[PDB]
Every structure is written in structure tokens, then in C-alpha cells.
Amino acid sequence: DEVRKNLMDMFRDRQAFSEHTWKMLLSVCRSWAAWCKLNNRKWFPAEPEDVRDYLLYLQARGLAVKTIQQHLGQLNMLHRRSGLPRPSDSNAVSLVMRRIRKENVDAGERAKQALAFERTDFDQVRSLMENSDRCQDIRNLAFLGIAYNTLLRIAEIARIRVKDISRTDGGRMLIHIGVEKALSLGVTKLVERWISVSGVADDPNNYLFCRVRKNGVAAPSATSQLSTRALEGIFEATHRLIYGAKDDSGQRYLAWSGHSARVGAARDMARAGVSIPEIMQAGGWTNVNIVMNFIRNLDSETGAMVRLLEDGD
Amino acid sequence: DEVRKNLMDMFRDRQAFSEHTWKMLLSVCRSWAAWCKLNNRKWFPAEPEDVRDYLLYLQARGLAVKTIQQHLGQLNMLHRRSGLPRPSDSNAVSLVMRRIRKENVDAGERAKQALAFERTDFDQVRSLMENSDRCQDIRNLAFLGIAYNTLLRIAEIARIRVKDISRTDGGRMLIHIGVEKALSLGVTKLVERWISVSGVADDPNNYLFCRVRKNGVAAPSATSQLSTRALEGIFEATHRLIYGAKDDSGQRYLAWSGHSARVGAARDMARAGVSIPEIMQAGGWTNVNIVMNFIRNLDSETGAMVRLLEDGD
Amino acid sequence: DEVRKNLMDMFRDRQAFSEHTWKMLLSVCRSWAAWCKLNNRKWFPAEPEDVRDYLLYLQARGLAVKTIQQHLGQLNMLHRRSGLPRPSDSNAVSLVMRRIRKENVDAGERAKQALAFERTDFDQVRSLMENSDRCQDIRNLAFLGIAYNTLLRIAEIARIRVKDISRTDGGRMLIHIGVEKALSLGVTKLVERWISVSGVADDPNNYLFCRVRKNGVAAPSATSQLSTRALEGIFEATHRLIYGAKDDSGQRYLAWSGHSARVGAARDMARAGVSIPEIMQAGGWTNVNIVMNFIRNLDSETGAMVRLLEDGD
DNA sequence: TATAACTTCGTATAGC
DNA sequence: ATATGCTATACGAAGTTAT
DNA sequence: TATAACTTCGTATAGC
DNA sequence: ATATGCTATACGAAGTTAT
DNA sequence: TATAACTTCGTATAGC
DNA sequence: ATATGCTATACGAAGTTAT
């Protein structure tokens, strides 16, 4: 680690890449480094046949193609940055990444996706929570409403500041995102409750969402945001609420997570006949391929042909 | 052939590729081989300037760019498989495939597409056949209904087994495909007739469609399916029924073929304002590019701007 | 120039490329040539490190990535044509084009787009012009109608010949384009006025639009078309009409231009829930990516989620 | 004449 | 999220008629 | 104290 | 049908307050 | 027998 | 606007039953 760490420390501007990206670079580098160590190989610069065997090593441990792509990519970076040929540009490496994929496009392994939080889900949760006078519930129900209505990422929701909210037609809220997002009358109402009870509106620089301790005492803040982990947890808790704990099969997506609402909303708009430009606008997509992929798991069956044949649309 | 044949025979696992693919590999190889023979050239490994002249040869005979791409691709495979450089990776080859295309993107030659079997077509055929008490007609009308309603390929339709059928809302049938496909009330009814008269439901392992000999006697079966050729022929016959024989201009798509219903349905859904996700779901597409291309010949003119301007939508 | 010019003069068939393309080739070549001159460098064949410094030179002067891509592309052509390696295929060149882009995808510089002429705009213009008895106004209002209704490019509109017009359902006009474009009842009416007053229908080979001099006297013609510059000017004038002159900030798109109607119409159809195939048909697009990009600036906010949640669609 | 109302051009840049 | 190729518009300015 | 209700982390992997 | 790059979430677990 | 109504095939080419 | 890979249909013709 230290070695991995201190060696790096350079790339002049940390700011050259994202903190999220520097994080992954380190993990990979640490990973690659331990391996090279154990197997007595040269860490940097990296030899292709070694990179190739390192990926195979990842594959042989059960890692996704996407995870392997990651380790490869960060490795490619180091080299590229430090002005050296890219492991990727190595017949050996090219070849493995190809062998590894086929192996699974064949194998039937495909990228997963968060368990959808759809309208039926939202409705049910409201049936259970709308009446609650518990701060936590008032907060979380508003959070889910926004998540579902706006399709924003948890990192976007967490950074909403009270000053980002305005009103539009019919008094619905308007949330400005670095883009503007409109809430329905009902979601606006839930958010207004969270707002009146919480106190966040006391300082417009206050983040719309904040902690609520066991006291049930809220703690508005313009400097600290609820972690994305916390937001994930609201999803999970809510899941638990209606379905009880999860089995220990150890696999992802057994409960709702941070993308559940973005996934579900997308599916809801698609199943409802909504057009691609509108869908794109609802979630802020700019690529048709990216959005169509994101909705790769439409879960209802729309019977466009039945409708057409029955002339009943 | 034999030489072409027996030399191949290897690729350890036939199963490595599809039977349809091994078929094309052989044809090409036979083609390439005869040419090399006649022109005294080395068949394997293949020399680029020779591959290049072999493609030009295909072009100079009237073959489509897609057919040339095929011969090239199989040739590329052999080499790749047998661990050798890909003719494709040869300046000479790269260059021709480029020259050859331009030559036609210019030339105005474009990929064809099956003659569409659309709702108007389906309706007309029903006007003619619905009343028939002829087994053949009861069968074929049900086949066309499924083909149009579901947009399934002929190879998918041919492998439907009676046990793949269930019911849904309003008693409409549900056909499970390795995905589920819902039929409208009317198509379900046509299929039910075919089912009651044919006897296929006697053994649930029975393929939904089967032969009907000159006797008019059906022959249900769980081991043998109607060939895709036969299904193509139903399309053709039906075409002939309403338009009489085809001219001997010798060109493809003069009558309906196996894709006519998939093509037509797609066009019908597109002309009707149906959204891309729904269209995608109706035909089981996952790529937006692939579906938009497939509907490259929308044949009605939708006047979205006229509708918008006339505020009459 | 002369040197640039006369050296070129070859490419056997001028017809090998478009006149618009030969125009750009010359400009670039003239540009590149002057630079090479000033900086004492070899014009042809071109050395990569020189090409690289020439692009940097363009960047260092404020030119768009698209403009740089152009100079690069024409340069690549010359070489390619004259059977030489492509500057593009040069580590140095590859690298700059990459550095230059990042520099702006980062920089926030993005391709611009013409100021939209949308339905609200069309309506307003009609409020102002419909009553006019001025030839110029009768002409221009019809031109804008066609531009908006059909989404055709100015070079397509300019080449419409009176003989390209037919009628359809309800007596709406049908304009055949090398494709057929239908006008609404109202736009057809505006065009009919322009037609009756102008005299163009006297010779069916007459271009639908023609000059109208200060006399107010039209000059129908089957040999000369209104320049695309003129059409651009109608857009500008009309803009000026409702907003007065433009500031001298010197930037593009301060007033309506030739693409304003194609842009606006597209946005209008998108905001209205119209499907992608229909949108594609309205503007004659065949690529989903190309159309989605073209509508990268949807300007209204459709609230598909609000509609869905309010069950009010 | 003077001028509108164009056309022609050349560099810059969007869109298929 | 993405590069590279050909063809189109953007627009100020200079040249052209028929007034 | 114990604890809820967080935050911080690190490996794994989805999505723009 | 498709590769490769950067940035985001997924989630168990270990650390942190204010009860 | 003759024949319909298939199946099998092989080259050509569309579609995922 | 775009190349390249694998798998499917297109269709005339020759072979196969059960009439």
C-alpha cells in the first residue's frame, strides 16, 4: 500500500482526475502490486504476459467482466500517464480481454442492475408511511418521492440545497440541479412536510436532507450532507419494512439500493408508452444507446401488437 | 469439396460455432478453393493480394456487399482460428473492401428487405380464409396471425411446442419463447381452431404446427418440425393466392417470405406512433440502431408536422 | 493561392468529390500553405510534427474543435489521395487531436446550434404578416411555413420546382423531394397565395421561390434559384422584424438562420411526445443517434414523471 | 444616382 | 461517455442589377 | 452504558 | 450483435456521536 | 402412377 | 454518415412419402 501509495503521489494535479477515480487507481494498484509480489513479478512498468495472467487471475476468482475491465483500465492509465505503452496495446492483453468476455457472453453472465422501485412500490410505501408522524419517516418518504419523481442519483439528491427549490405551475416544487426538476403536487406536499418539520429552510444554504438522530432531533446543515451510504440505507430499510430481512445468499440487489428509483421510474415511463426524448429528459440522458441499455429489463410486457390488432389501444 | 471438407474437419468442437455458421464456412471455402484452383493460387494459408483479387472477382460477378463481407469473414476466421494473420489485416484487403463499398454506396445498391405483410394484408387474407374449412387454410391463417402478432422469426415459430402456450387477460394465448408473447383475442381464436382440428394438443410436446398432406390429414409431432422452407412457402402461397404467380425477373422479394410479417408489423407499429421501447419489446430488439435500421423503409408517411400544425393530432 | 490552386487541379474527376468539399479543401490548403510559408515548413508532403503544430496554431487562435477537425481532414485527404500516409496516422497528430478535444470537453466549449424558429415563433410571425399585401411578405411567410412544416434544408427549399407540388387528403400540398412532404391546410394556403401572386406556376419548371425586386416585381425562373444566402436573410429579416437589430457581440445565432425552422420543429415534435420514428420521418433522418443529437437542446421540460404521478397525462 | 434585394465568396463550423 | 469523413449551413462583405 | 443513526472505507461493479 | 475510459453506486464492516 | 406437400441443400444475402 | 462477426432467412431445385 504505502509503496503503492507514495510511488503514485504525483500526477501533478490530483484535480487531473476525480477523487472517485484516484480511489479506484489505488485499489487496482494495490491489487496488482500484491499479486506481482506473491508471484514475483515486476510491478512497473508492467509486462503484458504478466498483465494477461493477472486478469486471468481475476477471472479465475469470480470477478465480473466489468471489474476486470476496471483493473485493466487503471493499469492502462498508469502506463499511459507515465508515458509508456498501454498494456492494452499488447497482443497478449488484447487477446485475453476477448477470451474472457466470450467466456461469459457465452457463460450467460451479464451485468446486474438494482432492484426497481416502481410506482406500485412507491404507492405501497406511502400507504404505510404517509400517516407517520415520525421525523425519520417524513424525511425518507420525501426522499423516495424525489428519487422516484426526479430519477436523480443519490449523490445529486444529497447535494440539493434548500435554495435550489422554486415553484411552478400549480405550486409544484422546482429543483435546480447544477437543469430543473419538477415535482408533482403530491411529492411537493411530502417534501414540504419534511421541510416544515425539519427546520432546514432556516438557512437556505442548508442541504434539503440531513441526519435525524435517535432523539428524533434533526440537524440541519449547509456544510455536511447525508452520505450516499445513508441514502442507500433508506432504500434498504424501506425494503426491509415491507419484506423483512434479506437471505444470506450474499448477492447484490436483494433489497432496494440507491438506483432502485431511477431504474423503476425509467421502466414505468417505458411501459407507459412514453417517448424516448421524454424519457431522456426525465432522467437527463443524452445518448439513446445509454438509455435503452439502462432500460434493458422492461418488466411488464406492453402488448403494442395486441393493442394494434384489437384496435383497442 | 472433399479436400475443402476433410481438411477442415477439426475446429475441435463443431459446437464451437453454429451449424448455420459451419455451413457458410464450407460454401465460402469451397468457393475460394475452386477459384484458387482455376487461377492457380495457394488456398491456405491465403495471400492477401489473392484474397483481394478473389473479392474483386465476387464483385465483378454481381454479388452484394453483404455476400462479399461474408466470404471475407469466413476467410478471416479460418486464418484466425488456425492462428494466422487475418486477410482482413492486410492493406490490400482493407483497401478493397473500402473500394468495393464506396463503389455501391455510390452505385445506389443497398440491402433489400422482404416484402411486408401488414395489417391490411392480414385483414385481406382473413377475408379470404377465415371461412375456409380446409385444414391447410385453418393452419396457415393461424400461422400468419402468430407471425404478424408476435413478429417471431420462422425458426422460432417452427419450434413452438403446444406446452409453450398459456392464457392471460381475457383468455388470450401466451406463447413462451425460450420471453412470453401475447396474442390478441382474434389471433388466439384462429390458433385455437388450428389446435382443435389438428390434434396437436394430444401430446403437449407436440409442435404447434405440423404437416398436412394432400389427404388433408394432419400429422402432429413432438420430434419433427415444419421446415423453415415450408413456412416460407405458406407466405409465398398466400401471396400467390391474392396476386397470382410471380414474374420471372428472377429477383428476391417478389412475393411474401419468412420476414414479411416481422417487417410489416414493425412498420405498422411505427406508422401508428408507437414508441421505440414498445416496438423493441414487440419484436424483442435490444439495440435501438438495429431496430431503426430494420424499419428503414417506413411506408406510409405520418404527417407529425401536419398533425402538430393542425393541432389536430 | 495560385500555387495552392494550380498544384491541386487534378484529382482527375472534380466530380470525385462535392463542389462544397473542393471549396473546403482549397481553403484549408491555402491556410496550411500560408502557415508553412511563414514558418518555413514543407507544405507537401506534410510532416506530422508540423501538422501537429499547425492544429495547435488553429486552437491557439480560438477555432472550434469542428474547424480544427476540418483542416485536419482535408489534410488527411490530400495525402490519402496522393497515395501517402495520413497525417492522422501519426502518433503526434493522433495525440494532439486528443489533447485539443479534452482541452474543451473540459473547457466547456460545445458545438453551437441555430436559434430555433418554433411554432410560437411561426404563429407570431403570421400574426404580423398574414394580412400583408406585400409580395415580399407573401413570399417569405410561405417560405417560413414550408421551412417549419417540412424541416427541409435551405438548399432543398431553394430547389423546389413548381412541378414538384401535388395535392393530397383535403387538398393539402405535397412536395416531392428528389421523398414527399405534406403541408397542413394553413401552410398550403400561404403557399397558394405566394403562387397565385408570384406567377411561378406559369412554367412548371419554375422554382417555387424567386427574387422580388424593390419594384415588388417578381421574377419567376426555371434556371435561377434564390441563393441559400437569400433564404438565410429572410430568417434574419424576420428576426429583425420582431426584435430589432442584433448586438455587435459578433457571435453566431443572435438571429434566426437557415436551420432555425428545422431545429425548432424538431423541438416542437419532441416536446409534444411524438415518437422517434415519426420525428425521424418528419425530418428525413435515418440515424437515431444523429436525430437525438440534433435535438440535444430540447427547450421546454416535459414533466413525463409529473404526468405519470398525477396520472394526469 | 442610390438603393433594395439580391448573388458571390471565403473562413468558420454544424450535421448527416 | 467516445473518432473520422464528407457535405451542409453561418455570416460579413464585396459585387450586381433594375430601379 | 448501549445504541441508533449515522460516516468512512475498501473491493466489486454498474452507468454515463 | 460489438471495445475502452472515467465516474458512479453496492454493500459489509469498522469507526463516531449524542443519546 | 402422379402428385401435393413437404424436406434437404447450396449459394446468396439480410439481421442481430 | 461509418467496419466486422456470427447467425438467420431467400429461394430454386432435387429428393421423399403417402397418397
mmCIF file of N, CA and C in Angstrom, chain B residues 35 52-64 68 100 103-104:
data_model
loop_
_atom_site.group_PDB
_atom_site.id
_atom_site.type_symbol
_atom_site.label_atom_id
_atom_site.label_comp_id
_atom_site.label_asym_id
_atom_site.label_seq_id
_atom_site.Cartn_x
_atom_site.Cartn_y
_atom_site.Cartn_z
ATOM 1 N N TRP B 35 -11.706 -21.157 -56.959
ATOM 2 C CA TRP B 35 -11.080 -20.000 -57.570
ATOM 3 C C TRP B 35 -9.592 -20.118 -57.587
ATOM 4 N N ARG B 52 -7.726 -10.293 -51.997
ATOM 5 C CA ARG B 52 -8.163 -9.054 -52.661
ATOM 6 C C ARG B 52 -8.720 -9.307 -54.095
ATOM 7 N N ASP B 53 -7.993 -10.071 -54.893
ATOM 8 C CA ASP B 53 -8.463 -10.354 -56.236
ATOM 9 C C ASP B 53 -9.670 -11.287 -56.220
ATOM 10 N N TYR B 54 -9.777 -12.129 -55.184
ATOM 11 C CA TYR B 54 -10.948 -13.022 -55.035
ATOM 12 C C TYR B 54 -12.258 -12.265 -54.698
ATOM 13 N N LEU B 55 -12.138 -11.227 -53.878
ATOM 14 C CA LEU B 55 -13.283 -10.384 -53.551
ATOM 15 C C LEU B 55 -13.721 -9.625 -54.838
ATOM 16 N N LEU B 56 -12.747 -8.994 -55.510
ATOM 17 C CA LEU B 56 -12.981 -8.266 -56.763
ATOM 18 C C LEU B 56 -13.706 -9.205 -57.734
ATOM 19 N N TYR B 57 -13.272 -10.459 -57.727
ATOM 20 C CA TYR B 57 -13.911 -11.459 -58.549
ATOM 21 C C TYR B 57 -15.417 -11.565 -58.171
ATOM 22 N N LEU B 58 -15.713 -11.592 -56.865
ATOM 23 C CA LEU B 58 -17.112 -11.686 -56.398
ATOM 24 C C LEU B 58 -17.884 -10.444 -56.811
ATOM 25 N N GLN B 59 -17.260 -9.285 -56.608
ATOM 26 C CA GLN B 59 -17.873 -8.031 -57.009
ATOM 27 C C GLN B 59 -18.147 -8.045 -58.513
ATOM 28 N N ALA B 60 -17.123 -8.418 -59.298
ATOM 29 C CA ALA B 60 -17.246 -8.435 -60.756
ATOM 30 C C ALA B 60 -18.276 -9.436 -61.279
ATOM 31 N N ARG B 61 -18.821 -10.248 -60.377
ATOM 32 C CA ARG B 61 -19.921 -11.129 -60.762
ATOM 33 C C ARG B 61 -21.339 -10.715 -60.338
ATOM 34 N N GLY B 62 -21.472 -9.577 -59.685
ATOM 35 C CA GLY B 62 -22.801 -9.142 -59.286
ATOM 36 C C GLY B 62 -23.212 -9.496 -57.839
ATOM 37 N N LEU B 63 -22.268 -9.891 -57.001
ATOM 38 C CA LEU B 63 -22.624 -10.259 -55.645
ATOM 39 C C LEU B 63 -22.766 -9.057 -54.732
ATOM 40 N N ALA B 64 -23.695 -9.117 -53.768
ATOM 41 C CA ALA B 64 -23.907 -7.991 -52.825
ATOM 42 C C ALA B 64 -22.691 -7.703 -51.934
ATOM 43 N N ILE B 68 -20.050 -10.453 -50.147
ATOM 44 C CA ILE B 68 -18.601 -10.293 -50.213
ATOM 45 C C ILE B 68 -18.069 -10.279 -48.780
ATOM 46 N N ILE B 100 -14.726 -1.419 -52.793
ATOM 47 C CA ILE B 100 -15.967 -2.142 -53.148
ATOM 48 C C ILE B 100 -17.249 -1.503 -52.601
ATOM 49 N N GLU B 103 -17.981 2.036 -54.098
ATOM 50 C CA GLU B 103 -18.473 1.665 -55.413
ATOM 51 C C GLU B 103 -19.995 1.460 -55.488
ATOM 52 N N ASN B 104 -20.613 1.091 -54.371
ATOM 53 C CA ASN B 104 -22.036 0.820 -54.349
ATOM 54 C C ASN B 104 -22.848 1.775 -53.488
#
